[PDB]
Structure 1
Amino acid sequence: RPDFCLEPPYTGPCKARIIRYFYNAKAGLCQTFVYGGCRAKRNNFKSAEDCMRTCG
């Protein structure tokens, strides 16, 4: 599992309210967060599956 999986999610400076998935190492699962639409970091996935297949 890549190190980026342990970083907190990043909303960024844009103003949309896009639900994205991030790996929460404490819970051991992917959860959602609000992504602003630009400048994403790596712990940002379009589905729980993509998130779990990478960081799970």
Structure 2
Amino acid sequence: RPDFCLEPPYTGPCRARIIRYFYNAKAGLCQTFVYGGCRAKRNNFKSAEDCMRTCGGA
């Protein structure tokens, strides 16, 4: 539902390569993206099920 849920996926500065989830509102579903390890924003979920539950339908 929310408004962080519309914000684009933030990799940030750290050089990890960690696959996370974000709410893609242009697709209408939760997608994967490369999270660099630090300073995550809120549209950053550790599973699709969480993502769908917080953001799903935004």
Q: TM-score, normalised by structure 2?
A: 0.93
Task: Describe the superposition over 1:1-56 as per-residue Cα deviations: whole angstroms up to 9, x where unpaired.
Answer: 11000000000000100000000001100000000000000000000000000116
Higher helix share: 1
Report % sequence identity: 96
Count of equivalent residues? 56
Tell me how far apart the structure 1 counterparts of residues 2 and 31 of structure 2 sit (CA, whole Å): 17
Give the alignment's TM-score, normalised by structure 1.
Answer: 0.96
Structure 1 moving runs of 4+ over 2 Å = none
